[PDB]
Amino acid sequence: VSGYVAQEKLAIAERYLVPQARALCGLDESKAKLSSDVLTLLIKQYCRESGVRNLQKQVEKVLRKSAYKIVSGEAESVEVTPENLQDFVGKPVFTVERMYDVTPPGVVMGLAWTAMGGSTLFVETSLRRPQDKDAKGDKDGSLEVTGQLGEVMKESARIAYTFARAFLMQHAPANDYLVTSHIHLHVPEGATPKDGPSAGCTIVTALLSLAMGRPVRQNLAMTGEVSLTGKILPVGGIKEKTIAAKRAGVTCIVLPAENKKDFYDLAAFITEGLEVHFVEHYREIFDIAFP
């Protein structure tokens, strides 16, 4: 079984879920209406999870508060409206989907096929020391990874790092930022170890944003697997990843061409509004972000 797309949960819960809780409080819809707008607003705020259980808890709490307003309270017929809802369940907590929007240099979004569902955790990086420690200095601009690293992430990190160092020298010799400076890099935890390498293709683009210093093109989630010479490889579990990207408002995405098969299994409503970019060699990606 897969997760469920955010919009799809409305068509499920409005029929097979909402009436159940309506039978739990003993009311009929004639006296206890709950518009579609209240539910889409709900799922938009308090529960961004591929499963519907969390929305079921929210609507439960709201309903039981309505029951409390009936059985002892004033109204004989609570009438929920989307503007009213914040009364019942208090003020919205989360709002700012996609925290950064301009994405200032050296932080990039990345999909991750987590242990339950999928989430577009960002990966972040920054300088950690002044660069010109010695004009004649010949010391490697050492990286320092952080974020509950698995050892596999250590080999992936060095692989991606060396690939950055080769791409710069082949591309823009005048820059020397990488070989002449230290860099802190932080991958937030959540990915299960077996899928760990799939984040790696994101990593190199993070550093490159710091390198040229331009921000990455906006809201461009991606995933893949890097080969240490710019060839890319298939990653697994794509459907959870793509639905999470749909949840985040993503409007482009980049995958290895070898996964052109599984992506077509997806329901057609899932595929509307996206503009995918299958690729094999890494150089392609470099021209679809910066220029």
């Binding site: 808890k57 039981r64 029951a67 409390y68 059985v71 002892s72 309270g73």
Partner: protein
């Protein structure tokens, strides 16, 4: 037929769930067969006592006007208007739907700020029965569920004991010091509490001593931790962390 009949008269008063109706009936039939001198007769007599003792529908009535909660809250705690305002909103959203509704909640702040005192103040505000229950540093999950009743020395879990003592079907439980709960490898109670604190699974809570489900659905659990972050993520995430 004396113990059986006082269980019977209370059965005439308290409405046991029909599954509990049956279970107490077969155990009642078992009571007369046994010798008073038999060893199992003691554990099963005390078991039926423990089973019949539990309120089953006894309902301390609540006030449901917000106003009386306003007053009674201001009488015994000066200031600290924020928490009063929030708790008023919680009971307002509880009454908004109709009947009472569960939700878990947590309070946290410096020790001695008055937490438990306002807790009890709500118990007498709402008119529900009170019972504090510290759980700091425990790891013996059996205390929350008793023992099998086939184990030597088994007695029902703490929850059943509080129901026997508070005598209402809908008291105001107050878990204390969640932050220091013994959350170990030796059987983590904190995983075990999830069945308690789930708004839905309390309705069929069961404990190793008396297998039959209990119905806690009306109970109002509360939790107090000196700092809210140490509590494990799955548990902290359900209840709100008021400060």
């Amino acid at each position: 037929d004396a113990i059986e009949e006082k269980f019977r008269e209370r059965l005439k008063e308290l409405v046991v769930p029909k599954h509990v109706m049956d279970v107490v009936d077969e155990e009642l039939s078992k009571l007369g067969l046994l010798d008073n001198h038999s060893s199992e007769f003691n554990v099963t007599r005390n078991y039926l006592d423990w089973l019949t003792s539990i309120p089953w529908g006894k309902y301390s009535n609540e006030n449901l006007d917000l106003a009386r909660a306003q007053a009674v809250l201001e009488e015994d705690h000066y200031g600290m208007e924020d928490v009063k305002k929030r708790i008023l909103e919680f009971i307002a959203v509880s009454q908004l739907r109709g009947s009472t509704q569960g939700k878990i909640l947590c309070f946290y702040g410096p020790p001695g700020v008055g937490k438990t005192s306002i807790a009890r103040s709500i118990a007498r505000a709402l008119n529900r029965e009170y019972f504090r229950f510290s759980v700091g540093g425990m790891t013996d999950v059996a205390e929350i569920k008793g023992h099998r009743r086939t184990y030597v020395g088994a007695m029902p879990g703490k929850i059943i004991q509080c129901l026997k003592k508070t005598k209402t079907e809908n008291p105001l439980i107050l878990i204390d010091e969640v932050d220091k709960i013994g959350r170990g490898y030796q059987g983590d109670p904190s995983s075990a509490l999830l069945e308690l604190l789930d708004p839905e699974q309390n309705a069929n809570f069961l404990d190793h001593y008396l297998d039959v489900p209990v119905d806690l659905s009306k109970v109002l659990f509360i939790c107090t931790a000196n700092v809210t972050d140490t509590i494990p993520e799955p548990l902290r995430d359900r209840m709100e962390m008021i400060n």
